[PDB]
Recover the amino acids of this structure.
């Protein structure tokens, strides 16, 4: 629900789909890769 | 803007267009 913000202070809510997009950005992938493929990543994750 | 889910409609301001024109 809040990613990593609650470990440094107050828990700050953000939608999870947006949490995943920041995480791809942290590894050098542009954030539209998730937003345009949200269903594919969620379905592939669920099987994995 | 027809593949991302959750898009909202809003105006994006370009600073060049007004001043230039
Ligand atoms: C965001 O703006 C677009 C463009 O004006 C809207 O698309 C129109 O939506 C109406 C129905 O609400 C349709 O009758 C039109 O044919 C659509 N236009 C096009 C070019 O497809 C879109 O609905 C807006 N989104 C919201 C949430 O209001
Ligand atoms: C968010 O969930 C509501 C139902 O609580 C739904 O109607 C809406 O379409 C959802 N928004 C997005 C962007 O999926």
């Amino acid at each position: 629900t809040s990613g990593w913000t609650f470990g440094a202070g107050p828990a700050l809510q953000i939608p999870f789909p947006m949490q995943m997009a920041y995480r791809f950005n942290g590894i050098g992938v542009t954030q539209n890769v998730l937003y345009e493929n949200q269903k594919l990543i969620a379905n592939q994750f669920n099987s994995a | 803007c027809d593949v991302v889910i959750g898009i909202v409609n809003n105006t994006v301001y370009d600073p060049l267009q007004p001043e230039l024109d």
About this structure: The CA atoms of residues 23 and 29 of chain A lie 9 Å apart. Helices of chain A lie at 16-26, 32-35, 38-47. DSSP finds three helices and no strands in chain A. The radius of gyration of chain A is 12 Å.
